[PDB]
Amino acid sequence: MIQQETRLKVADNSGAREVLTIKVLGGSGRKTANIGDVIVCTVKQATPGGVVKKGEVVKAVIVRTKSGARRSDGSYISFDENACVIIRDDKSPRGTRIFGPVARELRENNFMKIVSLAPEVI
């Protein structure tokens, strides 16, 4: 359950290592987000030189959460950290690599490229 002022950690090789959310898109008074949603965030930790810079405002997709997703058949999934991938408005990976496991829910949200680049999908 990600919300305002929640610090995630990027899982791609763009140069940003930690972001802080600003708003959750997709509703008049929406206040929570889960796996497979899109958020707007500000970069809080980045290398002095690189593609992205500190203080920049971007948007990302959540891929891991402490509380996972209740699947249809009654199975549950859960991770140990909250991670996001920075994207463009056309839903493509801004970086080149995806690190760590990636939830399968992304596949049903037409995030095909991220799923393809992921090493292991659970």
Partner: protein, 267 residues
């Protein structure tokens, strides 16, 4: 980016406009290190049909040659300019005669009109964190205004009667509501004049380092006990030490404003 513009700044403009009539002469304080970017067009639009003089305070921290060149550029532009050091009176003696020469026309007109000459009314205006109050305290020798090493000390305009000769008006610093050119904002943030808790210090440090590498490579070489000019910033940061990954940015900006380096200017 940089947006700092509280409500007292907004009230200052209205107060200055409402008390414009009494003003005889205007002093516009401008930092010497950044003479062009430190000017405020917003307050200049309000200020017209009034003689004025450009003042360059904190002139000890800037290079003499560039300041003198800028003084020439202001002089042949069509405005009088001077270089002043507030903390120790360097050029403070040669401002009363300049004011007298400027206002002599109205002074003689009034004298021939049949009244005794009166005191000169001056208004001091400029951006925050410049010697707007230290200059007044030096001029009055009284230490009557409050001064500090951070922007935003005074909050209300005040009248100061220096003898029977001057009536000075002080004013809190004023910034334009929205910046346009990011380089000017970066320079202003480097020199101070901003609360420094609203901006990104890392970008300021990066700008300082790249400007130094471009202009004063030798001063960057000497630095503080290390001699290298690599491509990134992490080489110099971890000189003297988990250590602060990038909090050393503050250190980079800490010494420069205190002139640990030699005198320099950004122009």
């Amino acid at each position: 980016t940089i947006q700092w513009f509280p409500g007292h700044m907004a009230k200052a403009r209205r107060e200055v406009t409402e008390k414009l009539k009494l003003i005889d002469i205007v002093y516009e304080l401008v930092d010497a290190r950044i003479p062009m970017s430190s000017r405020n067009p917003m307050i200049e639009d309000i200020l017209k049909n009034k003689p004025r003089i450009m003042l360059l305070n904190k002139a000890d921290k800037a290079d003499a040659a560039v300041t003198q060149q800028w003084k020439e550029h202001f002089e042949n532009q069509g405005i009088r300019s001077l270089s002043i050091n507030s903390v120790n009176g360097q050029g403070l003696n040669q401002i009363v005669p300049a004011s007298k020469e400027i206002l002599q026309e109205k002074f003689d007109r009034m004298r021939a009109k049949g009244v005794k000459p009166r005191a000169i009314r001056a208004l001091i205006i400029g951006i925050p964190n410049v010697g707007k109050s230290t200059l007044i305290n030096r001029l009055a020798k009284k230490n009557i205004a409050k001064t500090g090493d951070r922007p935003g000390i005074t909050t209300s305009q005040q009248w100061v009667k220096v003898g029977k000769e001057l009536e000075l008006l002080d004013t809190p610093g004023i910034l334009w509501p929205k910046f346009e050119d990011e380089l000017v904002g970066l320079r202003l943030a480097v020199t101070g004049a901003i609360k420094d808790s609203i901006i990104n210090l890392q970008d300021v440090a990066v700008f300082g380092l790249r400007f130094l590498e471009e202009h004063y490579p030798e001063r960057l070489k000497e630095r503080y006990g290390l001699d290298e000019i690599p491509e990134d910033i992490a080489e110099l940061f971890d000189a003297i030490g988990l250590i602060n990954y990038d909090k050393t940015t503050e250190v980079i900006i800490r010494d420069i404003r205190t002139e640990k380096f030699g005198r320099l200017s950004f122009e």
